[PDB]
Amino acid sequence: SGFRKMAFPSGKVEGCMVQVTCGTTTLNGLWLDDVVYCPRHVICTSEDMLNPNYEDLLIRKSNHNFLVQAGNVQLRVIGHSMQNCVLKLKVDTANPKTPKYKFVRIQPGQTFSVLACYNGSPSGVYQCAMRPNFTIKGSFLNGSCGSVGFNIDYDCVSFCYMHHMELPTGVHAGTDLEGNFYGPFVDRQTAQAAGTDTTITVNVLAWLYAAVINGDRWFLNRFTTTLNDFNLVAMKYNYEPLTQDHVDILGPLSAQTGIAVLDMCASLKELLQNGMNGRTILGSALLEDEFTPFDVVRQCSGVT
Amino acid sequence: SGFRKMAFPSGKVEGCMVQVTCGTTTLNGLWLDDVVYCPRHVICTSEDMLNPNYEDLLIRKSNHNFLVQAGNVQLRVIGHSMQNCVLKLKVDTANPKTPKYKFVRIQPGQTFSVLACYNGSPSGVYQCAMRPNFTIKGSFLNGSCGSVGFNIDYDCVSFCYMHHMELPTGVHAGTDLEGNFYGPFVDRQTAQAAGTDTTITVNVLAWLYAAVINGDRWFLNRFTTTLNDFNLVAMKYNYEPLTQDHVDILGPLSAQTGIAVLDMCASLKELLQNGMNGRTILGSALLEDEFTPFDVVRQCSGVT
Numbered sequence: 084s085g086f087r088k089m090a091f092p093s094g095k096v097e098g099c100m101v102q103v104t105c106g107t108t109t110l111n112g113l114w115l116d117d118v119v120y121c122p123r124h125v126i127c128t129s130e131d132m133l134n135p136n137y138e139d140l141l142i143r144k145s146n147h148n149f150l151v152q153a154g155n156v157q158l159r160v161i162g163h164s165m166q167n168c169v170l171k172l173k174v175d176t177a178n179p180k181t182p183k184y185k186f187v188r189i190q191p192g193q194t195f196s197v198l199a200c201y202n203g204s205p206s207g208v209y210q211c212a213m214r215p216n217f218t219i220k221g222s223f224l225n226g227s228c229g230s231v232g233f234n235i236d237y238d239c240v241s242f243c244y245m246h247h248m249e250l251p252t253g254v255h256a257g258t259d260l261e262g263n264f265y266g267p268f269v270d271r272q273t274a275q276a277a278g279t280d281t282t283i284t285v286n287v288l289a290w291l292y293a294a295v296i297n298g299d300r301w302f303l304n305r306f307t308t309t310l311n312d313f314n315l316v317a318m319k320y321n322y323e324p325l326t327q328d329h330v331d332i333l334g335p336l337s338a339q340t341g342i343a344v345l346d347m348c349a350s351l352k353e354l355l356q357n358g359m360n361g362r363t364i365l366g367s368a369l370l371e372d373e374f375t376p377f378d379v380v381r382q383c384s385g386v387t
Numbered sequence: 388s389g390f391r392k393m394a395f396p397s398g399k400v401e402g403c404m405v406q407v408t409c410g411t412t413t414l415n416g417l418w419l420d421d422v423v424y425c426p427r428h429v430i431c432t433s434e435d436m437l438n439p440n441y442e443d444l445l446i447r448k449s450n451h452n453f454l455v456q457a458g459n460v461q462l463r464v465i466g467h468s469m470q471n472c473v474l475k476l477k478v479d480t481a482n483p484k485t486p487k488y489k490f491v492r493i494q495p496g497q498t499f500s501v502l503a504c505y506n507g508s509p510s511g512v513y514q515c516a517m518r519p520n521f522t523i524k525g526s527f528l529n530g531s532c533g534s535v536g537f538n539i540d541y542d543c544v545s546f547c548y549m550h551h552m553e554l555p556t557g558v559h560a561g562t563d564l565e566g567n568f569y570g571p572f573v574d575r576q577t578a579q580a581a582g583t584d585t586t587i588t589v590n591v592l593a594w595l596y597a598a599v600i601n602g603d604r605w606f607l608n609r610f611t612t613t614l615n616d617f618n619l620v621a622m623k624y625n626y627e628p629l630t631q632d633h634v635d636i637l638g639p640l641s642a643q644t645g646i647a648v649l650d651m652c653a654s655l656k657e658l659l660q661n662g663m664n665g666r667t668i669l670g671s672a673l674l675e676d677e678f679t680p681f682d683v684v685r686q687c688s689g690v691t
């Protein structure tokens with residue numbers, strides 16, 4: 084019993100964190116096999132960030148200009164290349180702690196853990212979600228760039244995010260491990276506004292199922308709804324439209340609790356229309372959307 | 388920018404998790420140097436838990452009855468002893484992954500990270516607090532016993548909690564690493580009620596300072612209060628009394644923000660009396676109390 088915002092155990096990712104320095108800029112890198120991945124803005128000064136031409140800036144850099152340190156020992160850089168917004172620094176030594184891994188590009192609404200790092204050293208781990216506007220709501224200070232987001236399936240780490248920037252609104256943007264930004268963001272010190280941060284409806288429903296499994300049941304009502312009726316309400320409250328694909332993904336939770344997905348939609352419809360009336364669900368006074376249906380099943384079953 | 392419920396990187400603790408089996412019961416153990424620490428109720432059957440005489444049950448167990456497995460390899464048990472509610476299983480091999488460590492008994496209101504484990508394998512990491520009633524609000528299923536709570540200072544892991552039980556109300560109780568339960572709880576399958584779960588006032592104030600640092604400032608008002616006036620309000624709302632010791636601990640946050648501790652107390656007094664009026668602070672619709680002043684400083688400065 085109990086339900087917490089849980090992150091994946093970070094050990095396999097901690098063993099990959101290194102410090103990358105180029106000139107006067109230091110950030111984090113991810114060392115997998117004989118390659119170190121890091122944000123390409125490591126080659127920029129604060130002045131360069133205003134309007135950088137990364138291809139031109141890179142011409143002035145050689146392998147010996149990228150200082151890579153794993154703990155207290157120096158890695159020898161034998162090659163460098165730019166792939167989209169990430170630099171790939173080939174080193175002469177394979178990381179002995181390289182876990183089984185994959186690079187995945189996640190979709191909005193999916194969750195992952197972040198190992199926040201500074202100077203190649205891990206500071207903490209937290210769980211977050213790729214928002215529908217392609218930003219993440221993290222906790223990152225200057226020096227955290229190159230910190231990564233990931234999911235774990237048994238012994239395989241799927242890296243999905245690398246931190247690159249903070250928007251002027253305090254929200255965060257980054258890339259997948261191929262260097263492609265999520266959303267329309269660019270690695271430039273220019274104000275870039277984020278779109279509507281809508282609520283991840285399928286995740287709220289998954290979290291309501293988690294609440295019922297854990298005994299918080301006050302919000303269950305005598306009503307049902309349809310996908311089209313529910314979606315009129317979701318539109319009004321800046322919630323993502325629920326589809327039959329989302330209903331299908333909620334199937335195991337509906338089966339375990341015996342609460343039909345459309346009945347849980349009607350409970351959510353009432354919570355949106357009436358509010359919580361000073362009450363809480365799983366220790367929260369708002370509707371939580373950073374648990375996927377898979378996260379709920381995993382936590383509720385104890386998958387290791 | 389941004390402020391998250393962050394757990395310590397769990398790698399150093401993952402390297403200590405092992406599986407302990409005695410008879411038909413399996414739970415987690417903590418392997419440090421040549422000792423494996425685990426809850427003494429590993430020697431009980433479900434029937435024994437009703438009224439166990441641990442000293443008598445232990446007489447029927449020998450070193451070879453405690454099966455300890457670290458990953459896929461078996462540890463040889465060369466001694467066993469009971470210290471309060473924990474068993475200490477001496478093994479013939481020192482854990483090569485033993486980090487620098489200490490055993491600490493924490494006070495109510497202090498936070499720590501939990502590495503939830505099943506069958507010796509880590510499932511996830513989350514942050515929580517020792518409540519004023521000596522329970523923790525965790526996420527633990529059957530098989531999670533022996534999972535530990537800890538804090539990290541640079542390279543030293545301070546273990547403070549070992550999970551032993553779930554109360555009939557869905558809250559959790561456990562011991563320090565000396566086997567002494569926090570609070571009045573016992574390792575018996577008897578209903579034991581928890582006391583008033585009061586709010587950790589110093590932690591709420593610390594979190595309001597974190598909110599101001601991150602730009603959420605709507606709750607700042609034109610008022611001040613006194614410790615005695617604030618405490619009358621804290622009493623009414625089941626908040627812990629604020630002392631001059633708590634004010635002193637909030638000093639660095641008061642210094643950084645320029646907001647006097649008693650002025651922040653007056654903001655909190657108004658939030659208690661008026662509610663949030665449908666607004667949020669750091670993504671929360673309630674007053675968060677599971678960040679200590681030390682946690683706020685650490686996260687706001689990027690300590691690794």
Ligand SMILES: Cc1ccncc1NC(=O)[C@H](C)OC(F)F
Nearest residue numbers: 124223224225247248249270271
């Ligand atoms: C300051 C800071 C704080 C937290 N997270 C990231 C950054 N860093 C940036 O925004 C970098 C400078 O720009 C990126 F787009 F290239």
Ligand SMILES: Cc1ccncc1NC(=O)[C@H](C)OC(F)F
Nearest residue numbers: 428527528529551552553574575
């Ligand atoms: C069931 C369960 C689920 C989650 N956490 C712990 C337990 N386990 C217990 O309560 C054990 C049986 O009693 C302890 F007091 F000795």
